[PDB]
Design a protein around this ligand. Structure first.
Ligand SMILES: [Mg+2]
Ligand SMILES: [Mg+2]
Ligand SMILES: [Mg+2]
Ligand SMILES: [Mg+2]
Ligand SMILES: [Mg+2]
Ligand SMILES: [Mg+2]
Ligand SMILES: [Mg+2]
Ligand SMILES: [Mg+2]
Ligand SMILES: [Mg+2]
Ligand SMILES: [Mg+2]
Ligand SMILES: [Mg+2]
Ligand SMILES: [Mg+2]
Ligand SMILES: [Mg+2]
Ligand SMILES: [Mg+2]
Ligand SMILES: [Mg+2]
Ligand SMILES: [Mg+2]
Ligand SMILES: [Mg+2]
Ligand SMILES: [Mg+2]
Ligand SMILES: [Mg+2]
Ligand SMILES: [Mg+2]
Ligand SMILES: [Mg+2]
Ligand SMILES: [Mg+2]
Ligand SMILES: [Mg+2]
Ligand SMILES: [Mg+2]
Ligand SMILES: [Mg+2]
Ligand SMILES: [Mg+2]
Ligand SMILES: [Mg+2]
Ligand SMILES: [Mg+2]
Ligand SMILES: [Mg+2]
Ligand SMILES: [Mg+2]
Ligand SMILES: [Mg+2]
Ligand SMILES: [Mg+2]
Ligand SMILES: [Mg+2]
Ligand SMILES: [Mg+2]
Ligand SMILES: [Mg+2]
Ligand SMILES: [Mg+2]
Ligand SMILES: [Mg+2]
Ligand SMILES: [Mg+2]
Ligand SMILES: [Mg+2]
Ligand SMILES: [Mg+2]
Ligand SMILES: [Mg+2]
Ligand SMILES: [Mg+2]
Ligand SMILES: [Mg+2]
Ligand SMILES: [Mg+2]
Ligand SMILES: [Mg+2]
Ligand SMILES: [Mg+2]
Ligand SMILES: [Mg+2]
Ligand SMILES: [Mg+2]
Ligand SMILES: [Mg+2]
Ligand SMILES: [Mg+2]
Ligand SMILES: [Mg+2]
Ligand SMILES: [Mg+2]
Ligand SMILES: [Mg+2]
Ligand SMILES: [Mg+2]
Ligand SMILES: [Mg+2]
Ligand SMILES: [Mg+2]
Ligand SMILES: [Mg+2]
Ligand SMILES: [Mg+2]
Ligand SMILES: [Mg+2]
Ligand SMILES: [Mg+2]
Ligand SMILES: [Mg+2]
Ligand SMILES: [Zn+2]
Lengths: 155, 206, 98, 127, 24, 60, 117
RNA sequence: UCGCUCAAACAUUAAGUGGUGUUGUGCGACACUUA
RNA sequence: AUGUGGUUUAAUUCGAAGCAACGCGAAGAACCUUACCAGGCCUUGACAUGCUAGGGAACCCGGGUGAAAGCCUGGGGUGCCCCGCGAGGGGAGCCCUAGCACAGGUGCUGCAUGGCCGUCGUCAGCUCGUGCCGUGAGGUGUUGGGUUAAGUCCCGCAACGAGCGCAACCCCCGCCGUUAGUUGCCAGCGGUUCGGCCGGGCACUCUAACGGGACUGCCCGCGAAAGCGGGAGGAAGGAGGGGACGACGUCUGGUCAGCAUGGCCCUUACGGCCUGGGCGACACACGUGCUACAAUGCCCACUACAAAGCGAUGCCACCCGGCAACGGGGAGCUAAUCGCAAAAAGGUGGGCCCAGUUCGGAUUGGGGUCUGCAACCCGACCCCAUGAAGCCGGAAUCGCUAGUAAUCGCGGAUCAGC
């Protein structure tokens, strides 16, 4: 809208751990409005986490989303009649959004049969430092430093 | 424009059914069917005295055909002959217990349908179409109303291109419910075609 | 023992005739359960406005068919005459059975 | 003795008859963990109980009817709240800020005419 | 498949029952 | 064929699969509600007038 | 009047807001419901907007006027300062004095000296 | 899998003109206008 | 699948033509609906008023030719009023034949029109009265500053008010009570068939009806005013969400096939009837949609949670035949208490194993059921078999700001059935 900034949708905190970031991930997983289905599907991977590594699903989730959090991105902009690919910092919310989002997609990219195992293995490679979603993050940051020339229009 | 019919708009709140009665889902049609042909026959051989609100009531063989008129002196004739033979022709083709409860009209100028049919006739009789609407609205406001509005439409006098003559005074908040504004439609036969008529009288409030 | 049905359209006219019966039966006989409103069976009719083609802006009405129930127990002779004479219905088709 | 409160959401009503005791919770017969199976919102409806610090100390009995499966849960959530607040004025001073006392006006709206789903309009075109 | 002329939801979508669908 | 058809609609000489619905008022060939026996057009016309008992403007 | 029972809080404050602004400007004009036999002013130039009205209505024109003024368009002139409470007071007092002196009961001038400082 | 010419069909237009855009044939490795 | 352009045909009826035509008129094309064609027939008519003349009770059955319409004909029959016991005569109701006036027309013209509708757009606008300025067209007001969803309000203002608009009064969902108790309650007690089935009760759920409530009302901060931001109480704050409501007008918009209608045109046929065919044609193109191209999944067994609606010539619980559609026996129902009804998705368990696949059901062969005079053209629905295109799709492009999108079932209108 042109008037107000429109405030963010303060979502319901986690119903098992107590953290808004986790529930937000469920929503991205949520296909056709099946929260309870996606919730379980998420907790399914949480148990696959303790199966592989003796690590808590909580910090394994934080480390994953953190290493896929895009620091800077290139945005298109007009100037007299031309489009420049200007790089610049992203908003904290958008970083969290894209991170959570890419991860879900990266799970879909995997050959893994079951959804939970896709999110499981992906959450490992993400927290590690190399995965389908992470590489899509490294990619976007490249574009930023590449066009660093056009960074003169910070706006 | 649009402007949904003001009567159908006040249908629930202000004015009540011009034809009030209950019916089962079994014969609602047949009831309203005959109910229709009645008011039609009245509009025909009764328009002489200038009828307006042809109110109707039914329940079980009983039908209160209350007919509001400018001057019932014509709907009764002399002593009781016009009105009597009217009940005759009524149940003559029907079967229900006809009960013509005629009632005068305190002021035809404050009764929209009358005001319309009145001026609408003036046009048919070839008259000053513009000022005819002016006097009509002036007649209603000076009469005692609190709002007036009249609109003809079609070949004014007889011009090729169509036209619509707008004229009104006072207030006519058609968007408000607590207004009680009587609607007054009317035809107008001319040797050159048709001609529409409208009339709005604001009176009630709260 | 006896049961009365008060079907009708306008609830304003249904409330006047339903309250009338409650005063006439109680004030001149045994006990009588007050007006019992039932699920109003409504006929919602949707349809288009313009005569020709206008699959939108359409207008729709609704047929409010109300229902009210009143039960009188002891068959009082005063209540039978009271309701037989002192009645003022109109568009209210009532039906009564034992 | 008992703690009563009214639950409702999406035309899914829910009486709440609570009696201090163990933790056995019956709702329209059956058990709580029995009726609600594989649903995380289940343990969420008991949130009012975790807020008061008395999870296992109350036998609940709720009559929830109509509405959907989850709409009932939200009806139970607000129902239990009115129940425990009925005999506790001080527990409203910590159940309200946590957000519990609201019918949740959020309800499905009428499918508008000309449209398809109260808002979603058919695919616009010009070809 | 909401279009299979021989399935559960196959008849559910067509508003019928038949064999594969329980009927009285 | 408008007049000859409204008359034939009330005839029902042969089988019943010819006694098709037919509006009473303006005698429309289609959009004839069975309850009212009228066409959608004249239906609305009367409804605004108030000549249709119990038929109020729907709003919800 | 005992008719305040109706009228919701809406019309109340609004109608009170009516009275407030109504008196805000009209207070001093409503006392007469006819066309003044004459007009008196503090600065013909500034309020010349009214002078025209009176002029076109043939209403005689009297007004105190400083150098910043238009003498010819005033019937009976009152030359002298105007942008000073001191000079305005001496004139208005003595002027209205002639009003009551031709009327009846010559009273003492209104408490102006205190307001001056 | 890319580069290129040409003749349809479709898309951008309010419409046309032209162009632009994809798939189809044979080879080498937006700008202008609208009795 | 459906509409449309186009082409084809004896006809493939007509209209709407960017947005604002194209699942639109159509909320029901097999004959009907039907407005197009072919053929067989009628031609004061199927229908309104009225007139001259012969005969006749108004009324009912059959026969020959035929697709039917119709064409030719034969038979049974004899009411009421005015004069008489009978005959005989005239009139009203109603008909055939002949004749006159006249009917009828989905034949033109939506730039002849009424009415009704779309549209910009619920957008924030458009005007009148007097006063004032200009020779005048016209201006001012409605401009300006702050604010608002808004010409909302405030302050200022040669302007001062008002009117048509906006808001508000109208209904649903939002908190609770008042009124009524055949909706519901092992909640509290007795029988338990351990089923609110019986007794009992209405506080509570519900069914509808009336009323209160939210008003920038409170405090803090900015402010001249109007007003904005933040916090509490509250079911709900700054219109709470949605609907009804869509101005002066524009689009010479649409509609003479909804209807009314001026004029033009036809009047043994541009009117009327039937049968059959045709809006359903296919080398092609576009719009709107359903269902998929699958492992957040496909086939299957068990279990659970809706709202609203409809139901006498209609909804169908229980029992039997068969694979089943479906049929038959047969109880209840003027319908909060009988039926359509399992809501689906979802919860537990099984096969499946990345394959044109247990995905996908389009196409085609044969055998059945339902409605209807009649399913070749041209209906729906079972069952067995054939198991197609089809790996989330180019240029382009649409919807949607929250209980919305997406996704999953249900009901009606229309209606013989579809
Ligand atoms: Mg006159
Ligand atoms: Mg909260
Ligand atoms: Mg919805
Ligand atoms: Mg709802
Ligand atoms: Mg709704
Ligand atoms: Mg699917
Ligand atoms: Mg069904
Ligand atoms: Mg069986
Ligand atoms: Mg008619
Ligand atoms: Mg003084
Ligand atoms: Mg190319
Ligand atoms: Mg070629
Ligand atoms: Mg070549
Ligand atoms: Mg090369
Ligand atoms: Mg160029
Ligand atoms: Mg040129
Ligand atoms: Mg065509
Ligand atoms: Mg035509
Ligand atoms: Mg056009
Ligand atoms: Mg011919
Ligand atoms: Mg005649
Ligand atoms: Mg004879
Ligand atoms: Mg005879
Ligand atoms: Mg024969
Ligand atoms: Mg004979
Ligand atoms: Mg005779
Ligand atoms: Mg003629
Ligand atoms: Mg037009
Ligand atoms: Mg028109
Ligand atoms: Mg046209
Ligand atoms: Mg002048
Ligand atoms: Mg001059
Ligand atoms: Mg002017
Ligand atoms: Mg202006
Ligand atoms: Mg009570
Ligand atoms: Mg109660
Ligand atoms: Mg205040
Ligand atoms: Mg105060
Ligand atoms: Mg302070
Ligand atoms: Mg204030
Ligand atoms: Mg204030
Ligand atoms: Mg708060
Ligand atoms: Mg309070
Ligand atoms: Mg506000
Ligand atoms: Mg409004
Ligand atoms: Mg015509
Ligand atoms: Mg005519
Ligand atoms: Mg000829
Ligand atoms: Mg159920
Ligand atoms: Mg309802
Ligand atoms: Mg049905
Ligand atoms: Mg059966
Ligand atoms: Mg019954
Ligand atoms: Mg059932
Ligand atoms: Mg499952
Ligand atoms: Mg297969
Ligand atoms: Mg198959
Ligand atoms: Mg067939
Ligand atoms: Mg995707
Ligand atoms: Mg390409
Ligand atoms: Mg049917
Ligand atoms: Zn009609």
């Amino acid at each position: 809208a042109r008037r107000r900034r429109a405030e963010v949708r303060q979502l319901q905190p986690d119903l098992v751990y107590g953290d808004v970031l986790v529930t937000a991930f469920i929503n991205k997983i949520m296909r056709d409005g099946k929260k309870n289905l996606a919730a379980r599907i998420f907790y399914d991977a949480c148990k696959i986490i303790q199966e592989k590594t003796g690590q808590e699903p909580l910090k394994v989730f934080k480390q994953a989303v953190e290493n896929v959090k895009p620091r800077m991105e290139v945005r298109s902009r007009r100037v007299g009649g031309a489009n420049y690919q200007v790089p610049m910092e992203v908003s904290p919310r958008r970083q969290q959004s894209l991170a959570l989002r890419w991860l879900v997609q990266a799970a879909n990219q995997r050959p893994e049969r079951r959804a939970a195992v896709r999110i499981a293995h992906e959450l490992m490679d993400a927290a590690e430092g190399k995965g389908g979603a992470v590489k899509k993050k490294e990619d976007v940051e490249r574009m930023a430093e590449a066009n660093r020339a056009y960074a003169h229009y910070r706006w | 424009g649009n402007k949904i019919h003001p009567i159908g708009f006040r249908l629930g709140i202000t004015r009540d059914w011009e034809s009030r009665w209950y019916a089962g889902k079994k014969q609602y049609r047949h009831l309203l069917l005959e109910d229709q042909r009645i008011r039609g026959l009245l509009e025909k051989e009764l328009y002489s005295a200038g009828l307006a609100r042809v109110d109707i009531e039914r329940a079980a063989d009983n039908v209160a055909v209350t007919v509001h008129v400018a001057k019932p002196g014509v709907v009764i004739g002399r002593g009781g002959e016009r009105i009597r033979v009217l009940r005759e022709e009524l149940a003559k083709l029907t079967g229900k217990n006809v009960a013509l409860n005629v009632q005068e009209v305190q002021n035809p100028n404050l009764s929209a349908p009358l005001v319309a049919q009145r001026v609408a006739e003036q046009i048919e009789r070839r008259f000053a179409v513009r000022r005819a609407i002016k006097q009509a609205v002036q007649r209603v406001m000076e009469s005692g109303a609190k709002g007036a509005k009249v609109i003809v439409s079609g070949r004014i006098g007889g011009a090729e291109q169509a036209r619509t003559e707008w004229a009104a005074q006072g207030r006519v908040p058609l968007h408000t419910l607590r207004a009680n504004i009587d609607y007054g439609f009317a035809l107008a036969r001319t040797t050159y075609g048709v001609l529409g008529v409208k009339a709005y009288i604001f009176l009630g409030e709260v | 023992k006896i049961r009365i049905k008060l079907r009708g359209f306008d609830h304003k006219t249904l409330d006047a005739s339903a309250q009338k019966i409650v005063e006439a039966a109680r004030r001149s006989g045994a006990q009588v359960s007050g007006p019992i409103p039932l699920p109003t069976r409504v006929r919602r009719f949707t349809v288009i406005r313009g005569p020709f083609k206008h699959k939108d802006s359409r207008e729709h009405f609704e047929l409010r068919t109300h229902n009210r129930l009143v039960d009188i127990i002891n068959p009082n002779r005063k209540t039978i005459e009271q309701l037989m004479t002192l009645d003022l219905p109109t568009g209210v088709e009532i039906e009564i059975k034992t | 003795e008992q703690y009563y409160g009214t639950g409702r959401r999406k035309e899914a009503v829910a009486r709440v008859f609570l009696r201090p005791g163990n933790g056995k919770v019956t709702v329209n017969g059956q058990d709580f963990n029995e009726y609600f199976q594989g649903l995380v919102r289940a343990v969420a409806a008991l949130e009012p109980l975790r807020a008061v610090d008395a999870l296992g100390r109350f036998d609940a009995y709720i009559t929830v009817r109509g509405g959907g499966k989850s709409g009932q849960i939200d009806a139970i959530k607000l129902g239990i709240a009115r129940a425990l607040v009925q005999y506790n004025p001080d527990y409203r001073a910590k159940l309200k800020p946590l957000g519990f006392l609201t019918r949740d006006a959020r309800v499905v709206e009428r499918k508008k005419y000309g449209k398809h789903k109260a808002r979603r309009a058919p695919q616009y075109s010009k070809r | 498949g909401k279009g299979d002329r021989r399935t559960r939801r196959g008849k559910i979508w067509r508003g019928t029952y038949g064999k594969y669908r329980p009927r009285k | 064929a408008r007049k000859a058809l409204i008359e034939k609609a009330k005839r029902t000489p042969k089988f019943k699969v010819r006694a098709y619905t037919r509006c009473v008022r303006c005698g429309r060939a289609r959009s004839v509600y069975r309850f009212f026996g009228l066409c959608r057009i004249c239906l609305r016309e009367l409804a605004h007038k108030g000549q249709l008992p119990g038929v109020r403007k729907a709003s919800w | 009047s005992p008719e305040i029972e109706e009228r919701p809080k809406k019309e109340q404050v609004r109608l009170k807001h009516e009275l407030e602004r109504l008196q805000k400007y009209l207070s001093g004009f409503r006392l007469l419901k006819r066309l003044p036999d004459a007009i008196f002013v503090v600065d013909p130039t500034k309020e010349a907007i009214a002078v025209r009205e009176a002029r076109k209505l043939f209403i005689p024109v009297i007004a105190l006027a400083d150098t910043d003024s238009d003498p010819d368009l005033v019937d009976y002139i009152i030359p002298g300062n105007d942008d000073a409470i001191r000079s305005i007071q001496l004139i208005l007092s003595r002027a209205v004095d002639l009003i009551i002196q031709a009327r009846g009961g010559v009273v003492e001038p209104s408490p102006s000296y205190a307001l001056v400082q």
